[PDB]
Structure formats: structure tokens, C-alpha cells
Amino acid sequence: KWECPAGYEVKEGLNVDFPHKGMKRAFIVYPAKNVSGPAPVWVPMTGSVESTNDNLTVARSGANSILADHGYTVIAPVRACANQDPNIRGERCNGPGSNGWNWNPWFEGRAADPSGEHWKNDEGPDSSFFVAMVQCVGTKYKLDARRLFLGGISSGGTMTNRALLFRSNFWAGGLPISGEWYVTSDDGTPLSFDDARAAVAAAPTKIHQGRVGPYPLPAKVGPLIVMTVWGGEKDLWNCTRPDGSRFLCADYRPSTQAGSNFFSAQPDVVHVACSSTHGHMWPQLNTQEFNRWALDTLASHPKGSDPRSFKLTQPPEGYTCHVGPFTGLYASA
Known part of the structure; x- marks a missing residue:
């Protein structure tokens, strides 16, 4: 499956003018160090404000x-x-x-x-x-x-x-670290930020449809390991209006919950729910320890591995994680 479009020649570092669907895209490659053979891959993505x-x-x-x-x-x-x-x-x-x-x-x-x-x-x-x-x-x-x-x-x-x-x-x-799900009604109807937030609070253990994915969500997905991270009580985002005023437009408690419910329910997906207290930014406590642990945890479950043989190891101090959906975000009924 290794192929390039139109004879594109990739290089170490910044790659520009990569053709895709009529657009010209860029990406940066940092080749793995101290690895013999096929290296595992990490595709990190920034958010709205950090470059x-x-x-x-x-x-x-x-x-x-x-x-x-x-x-x-x-x-x-x-x-x-x-x-x-x-x-x-x-x-x-x-x-x-x-x-x-x-x-x-x-x-x-x-x-x-x-x-x-x-x-x-x-x-x-x-x-x-x-x-x-x-x-x-x-x-x-x-x-x-x-x-x-x-x-x-x-x-x-x-x-x-x-x-x-x-x-x-x-x-x-x-x-997915503090990502949205954009929860909708079961029939796909979009919900306001307030209604989406209330929808999950009203049914915290159920699968919720969302604008982040296909509608309806796929009945079955291919084999994966997904580690969803919630940043705690401060994992919120205030949008900025043109005049500069701020207002709450995203709460990642419901979205990490919803994501965890969907992925945990899938039989061929190992879902790890991780909680920290850094808020809405890249994990702040023991950051590199966390990045190493998280990626090595993902790598311990190569595609097509049996979810039954997966074994979670203790994350760095500042994180609480377990296999399954989030359980500490909403009270039990």
C-alpha cells in the first residue's frame, strides 16, 4: 500500500506542495531513530491556536x-x-x-x-x-x-x-486528547452546545451519534486501540467573538465520554479511558513520560491483535487510566 501521487519525492523535514484532491498540502517528517526495520508511526495533530x-x-x-x-x-x-x-x-x-x-x-x-x-x-x-x-x-x-x-x-x-x-x-x-464528538440526536439532528451537553448528562452510558463522524456511526469498525484523554474539570474551551468577548463553546467531559462509549462497545477495539487534571491543552504533568507511555501502549496492540491479550501498564503520575468507557465523569444512575 506504499505509494506516492504523481511521482512525489518525500524528504526528511518539511514537505510542501503535496497534491491531494486539488489542494497542495504540507507535512513534516522526523524519521525514527535507533530502529532496525519497519518503524511504528505517530501522526500528531495540533489544535486551533498552537502551530x-x-x-x-x-x-x-x-x-x-x-x-x-x-x-x-x-x-x-x-x-x-x-x-x-x-x-x-x-x-x-x-x-x-x-x-x-x-x-x-x-x-x-x-x-x-x-x-x-x-x-x-x-x-x-x-x-x-x-x-x-x-x-x-x-x-x-x-x-x-x-x-x-x-x-x-x-x-x-x-x-x-x-x-x-x-x-x-x-x-x-x-x-484523541480532549477532542469533540459534537453530539447529535439519534436521528442525526444537530444539537446546540447546551443541548448536546445535556444529552450526554441525561444518558451517560449510551452511544451517542455525533457530527464528528459518519451518520449514522458505523455499526462495526476495523481493529483499533483508542486512548481517549480527558483533562478534568478545566477541560473546557471559551470561543472568542469578533469583538473579543469570550464565551463557553465546548466542554470535553461529554465528548470524551461519548467517544469512550462508542469505542468501548466495539468488539475489535481496545479503548483506554485516561483522565488527568491539566485542563484543555497537551498533557502537562510529566509530559514526555506520558507521550512515551501512551505511544508505547498503542504500539503494544498492533492492528489485528486480540483485545483479550492486551495488558495495560501503569501510566505516569498525574494520570488515571483503565480499559473501557469513562466511569468517573457522570454519577451512576
């Missing part, structure tokens, strides 16, 4: 490129809105989406109005670009086809959820 460079090199943003020194080939996509500049932060990215998309950083969820209907059963240009990107990098570096993982924070966490839902026969798993 791809920040996500890859700044400690408080995760310094995801450091995982190449841990034996992973890191392949980081640049957001379409950044116009191939890995340094763009929130400029022209941190705001509502267009063309039927909910949020502009990534093509990660259909809009709440009718223009989003088209995306109910079309993965979108980011989900398909990531597959094409990894397939192309694999022509230059030897990658492990059973250990292709993606993940991200905030909007990047939402994009991880969407990619796992539409491309569960490609990725081996992912790390």
Missing part, C-alpha cells in the same frame, strides 16, 4: 518530534488553513469552518446547518490526505503497517476521532 511547529517542538505543546528519538517515525500534517506554513498559530485557522465544516483548523466535523449534510458520509479532505501522506512517506522510510497511529489535541483530537471512524481499516489506533 504544527509548536506541537512538534515546544514542551508545553507536547514536543511531539521527540518521539522520533523514542523509535517512532513522526509524520505531522500542517492544517489546510495555515497555507503550508508550519509556524501559523491561530491566524486564519482559529474560527468557524466553511463549505459545510464546523471548525476551520481541520475538516473534523460537519456543520450544524444544512450545508454540513454532504459530510455525513464523506470523510473529508483531511482524513483522506493523512492516509495518502503516510502511504507516501512509507515509500522512503520503512514503516510498520500494523502500527500506524494518529492523535492530537483539541480540534486535532476531534480530527483523530473522525479519522478513526472513517478509516478504521487503515489506522491501528489513535490518541
Whole structure:
């Protein structure tokens, strides 16, 4: 499955003008170090305000490129809105989406109005670009086809959820950190932030449909290991109006719960629910210990592995995790 479009020649570092669905995309490759043979892959994605460079090199943003020194080939996509500049932060990215998309950083969820209907059963240009990107990098570096993982924070966490839902026969798993689910009614009707929040609180253990994925959610998905991370009571996001005022527009308690319910219910998916207290940003406590543990945990479940043989190891201090759906976010009935 390793192939490049139009004779594209991948290189270490920043790759630009990668053709995909009429767009020109960019991504950065940090080849795995101290690895003989096929290397596991990590595709980290930034959120709405931090740049791809920040996500890859700044400690408080995760310094995801450091995982190449841990034996992973890191392949980081640049957001379409950044116009191939890995340094763009929130400029022209941190705001509502267009063309039927909910949020502009990534093509990660259909809009709440009718223009989003088209995306109910079309993965979108980011989900398909990531597959094409990894397939192309694999022509230059030897990658492990059973250990292709993606993940991200905030909007990047939402994009991880969407990619796992539409491309569960490609990725081996992912790390959606404080991503949205955009909960809807069972019939797909979009719900306001308040109604979506109340919907999960009213049925915390059920599977909820959401604008992050296909509608309806797939009955069955391919084999995966998914580690959803919730940042605690402060894992919230205040949007910014044009006039500068702030207002609550996302609460990641319901979305991490909903994601965990869907993935836990799938028989061929090992779901790990992890909670911390860093809020809505990349895990802050023992950050590199967490990144190493999380990716090595994902790698311990190569694609197609028996969920029954999976064995969770203790995460770093500052994290509580277990296999299954979240249980400490809503009171039991």
C-alpha cells in the first residue's frame, strides 16, 4: 500500500506542495531513530491556536518530534488553513469552518446547518490526505503497517476521532486528547452546545451519534486501540467573538465520554479511558513520560491483535487510566 501521487519525492523535514484532491498540502517528517526495520508511526495533530511547529517542538505543546528519538517515525500534517506554513498559530485557522465544516483548523466535523449534510458520509479532505501522506512517506522510510497511529489535541483530537471512524481499516489506533464528538440526536439532528451537553448528562452510558463522524456511526469498525484523554474539570474551551468577548463553546467531559462509549462497545477495539487534571491543552504533568507511555501502549496492540491479550501498564503520575468507557465523569444512575 506504499505509494506516492504523481511521482512525489518525500524528504526528511518539511514537505510542501503535496497534491491531494486539488489542494497542495504540507507535512513534516522526523524519521525514527535507533530502529532496525519497519518503524511504528505517530501522526500528531495540533489544535486551533498552537502551530504544527509548536506541537512538534515546544514542551508545553507536547514536543511531539521527540518521539522520533523514542523509535517512532513522526509524520505531522500542517492544517489546510495555515497555507503550508508550519509556524501559523491561530491566524486564519482559529474560527468557524466553511463549505459545510464546523471548525476551520481541520475538516473534523460537519456543520450544524444544512450545508454540513454532504459530510455525513464523506470523510473529508483531511482524513483522506493523512492516509495518502503516510502511504507516501512509507515509500522512503520503512514503516510498520500494523502500527500506524494518529492523535492530537483539541480540534486535532476531534480530527483523530473522525479519522478513526472513517478509516478504521487503515489506522491501528489513535490518541484523541480532549477532542469533540459534537453530539447529535439519534436521528442525526444537530444539537446546540447546551443541548448536546445535556444529552450526554441525561444518558451517560449510551452511544451517542455525533457530527464528528459518519451518520449514522458505523455499526462495526476495523481493529483499533483508542486512548481517549480527558483533562478534568478545566477541560473546557471559551470561543472568542469578533469583538473579543469570550464565551463557553465546548466542554470535553461529554465528548470524551461519548467517544469512550462508542469505542468501548466495539468488539475489535481496545479503548483506554485516561483522565488527568491539566485542563484543555497537551498533557502537562510529566509530559514526555506520558507521550512515551501512551505511544508505547498503542504500539503494544498492533492492528489485528486480540483485545483479550492486551495488558495495560501503569501510566505516569498525574494520570488515571483503565480499559473501557469513562466511569468517573457522570454519577451512576
